[model samples]
Target: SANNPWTGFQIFLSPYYANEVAAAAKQITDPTLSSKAASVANIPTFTWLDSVAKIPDLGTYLASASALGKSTGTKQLVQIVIYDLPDRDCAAKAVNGEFSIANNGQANYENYIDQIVAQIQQFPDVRVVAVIEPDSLANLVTNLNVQKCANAKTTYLASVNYALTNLAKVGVYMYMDAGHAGWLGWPANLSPAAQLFTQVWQNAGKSPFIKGLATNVANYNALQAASPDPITQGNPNYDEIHYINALAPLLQQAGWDATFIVDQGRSGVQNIRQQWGDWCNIKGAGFGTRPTTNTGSQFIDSIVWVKPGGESDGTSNSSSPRYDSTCSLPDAAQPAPEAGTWFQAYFQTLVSAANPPL
Candidate 1:
């Protein structure tokens, strides 16, 4: 989901995506929005899949490297993936009670974490923000049963704690997944369910593995608003701000004064009727929660575009190239879904947006 070039290094490739995002930012006119847009345009965005030294080759770098060089400023944002984790389809992994470090295997996982720490250490001048393992634990909670969910939670906590413990040398700010308030709040038991998982992860050891929780990873406002009870309909003034306010206490009571960070990735277009449907191209919805540096809550750190706009969820032909709207033709011919082809197409869209500088 983060692979969409619209907000990543590929945003540089597409002036349209950049301009559109920038225009959205301008509309917000918040200092945070302006500053972030400027910072994104200025920073040398890079991918962990590639060497960091080549970051300058990114369009963002090409556009603002000279200014950055003069300022001697450094900032790093990296995404981390948990190699093996249970998902909706893979409930077997969690059900068997085989959720342990030995079961998950730590060799490659440790190696990757070490490499990241080493990379950050290698560049001491840079400030890094690590978005660790998006949907890693959240998916398990959303899909597994109580016993299996507990085991999955334990394994996830162990792995994340291990990463945090070992990577402390890197000076990274780590954020854990809260599965977008919508998913976290559901079936009338969402808040408590999230609290259980968060508590387990936070108090699992001598030190907390995460700083705070991140919500709405790849979902829209509808998902964020889906929580029932005090935060949902029939509540007094149930809007995004109120929703966040309501959830903050729940997260805090779990022993995590941890702030929240939003994935504004695809929220540029907001307030659409989102029903349970397929994942594919959907577009033109306005942006949700104006881009802001301030989250109002000390616990709410910042809102970031974790899921960039214009990225393909997968070319399932649900609609347009970006999963911003419903599919035009149901059961259309969807060619074999190539591994990176979706990303390639996404990059093309971003490029198209940028050249004309939308």
Candidate 2:
């Protein structure tokens, strides 16, 4: 008689897939997927700059709902969105024209928002999904300008409303950022980053920064297909639901009703050969829109995977990094490319084509 597990599809565990499931549970030979990949290779794999200066005890080590359960019957959990936001030179440099956030700027951005408000004060009923800075306010409204994009959207809404008012006293769900609908269908460039989400939810006076907004974080699928064909061109004429119906009247003229989310982990099954700069070798592209459902788009409130589909967005040779590299190399300038071996050959081709049947 245990009912209540429907949070589905939100598995963004990137400490580079917890260091490739701790180096693939020491070369697993498959004793039942090596005992369920040794329970995520025995947890404890934090980083994003060590969850911005420490706040471990992730709710007593993610209190066991069978270690955050999910045989696809829904009720998924693993939500660690810690993006190292300290010293803000805003890393993305290398002559791409500005971004260095001076290395942990502003006292490591108030000590990583006070260590995510002391690690969500030991999770109150743990539901965590805080993706605060992926592309930090959309790279200051798509690469700074106007007074450094209004001071990087006022220091990214004062460090995401101080980590959503200290992780909403323990309930966590802070999504914020609307750079997905092809960077908010150009309201003179996403209406100044959608007015920094109602100016950080009216300067955090708006209860727990009111959840809703996120989009194609690591982006792909033709850059979340929703433009008149431009996210580095492979033209399907972009359609992430037409960038959520052209930003639903500017998120209803900024009063709020925005509701958005997407990253579909690696757009499961759709990269038909390079578009939006062909992320590596682009193969089956499986998990895009199916996280317990809700893309009927009344302003899409779910379709996560924030970004975790065989990790490595770093090394590059591309065919989508040889279909995310789980090692078998015919040659991509090899040098130990087997680590998480392109997410274990894309999770063994999604457990041998159960497709999204999971």
Candidate 3:
């Protein structure tokens, strides 16, 4: 009971694993991966709020959630992330989805979100935290030259506004995703990013616009539990913890009750490779803190494990269908698996090299 302070937090929905009652065997190949799997395997990693074609499969998800709750005699805590935005990650080639406003993507996205809300409303007792589209608001600030960026700005905002309106009507707690520090830490981008998020929030036309903002949703950015103590030049305070603090005033001024959660799933690092911001399933990466409601920071709700570990970010080699240059860095894991499959070697590295010795 001490492990679950949030009261709503539950471990009833990990498809890759079984509950302790059925833990005779694990479904892992690597010993390192296997050992750690038992600890986190039953924990609920985010089930993504994917695109129209993908998001429509709500029946199966709810059915599974119902079964899991019955099995564990507890409600399931689901982190549903909405990542499909038009021209998402214009800087990166892969990870883009099948939605763009130019081809009626806005209508599709609104409808998709509406379907999710309508269905989620049916389960009154279940805990549902809807993560408003990650990279959607942030990308609008950072990249303007990429494909359809210029054309889709207003439509994208409209799509998100619609989601906020519809989801709020359902009484579901929602968190909009703000890009991690690497993208918005600089002085130039920070204000603009905050303003953009605020602008979107204001336009949503609702009393409870968002539960909070989420950062490092699927990123490997460090949350930095300690250090940067003196606010000196030694560390300029560029990590997520500091970044969230920096944006707090602006968010507050904009009438946002700025609470946040960081995904520390990959924040713990054993070694640095080509660059600090290399995001595609880097080598020597390890699991950071486990999910907790208390983040030490007043505005932070929790440091969470919202994304699954041992999953490939994107393939580094050419064998995969899509190619993002970030995945091919000198430090990236070679012979990588596809974007969401289990990578035995990567899993081994994360568990064995975990910071604070997991």
TM-score of each: 0.59, 0.30, 0.85
Q: Give the lDDT of residue 132 in candidate 3.
A: 82
Error of 1 at 341 (Å): 4.8
Question: Cα lDDT for residue 276, model 1?
Answer: 27
Question: Which candidate gets the maximum TM-score versus the true structure?
Answer: 3
Which 10 successive residues of model 3 have the least lDDT summed?
Answer: 16-25
Residue 200, candidate 3: C-alpha displacement in angstroms: 0.7
Report the lDDT tens digits of candidate 2 across residue range 1-358. Answer: 0111124433424344556655665566766655554444232222233243234534344454325544334443445564645423242321111123455455566676666666555444445666666656666666665454455555565666777676666666667646565455544555666675677777776664356666766555432443354443432325566665666567578666656666665554543433353343244444344454456666666666655554544333334322233222332223323222354555443333323433
Q: How high is the lDDT of residue 207 in model 3?
A: 45
Model 3 per-residue lDDT tens digits across residues 270-343: 23545556778777888887777768788787777766777778877775567787888887887787776667
How many angstroms is residue 310 displaced in model 2 relative to the true structure, after the best TM-score fit? 4.1
Q: Order the candidates by TM-score, highest first — what do you get?
A: 3, 1, 2
**How high is the lDDT of residue 87 in model 3?**
56
lDDT of 1 at 268: 41
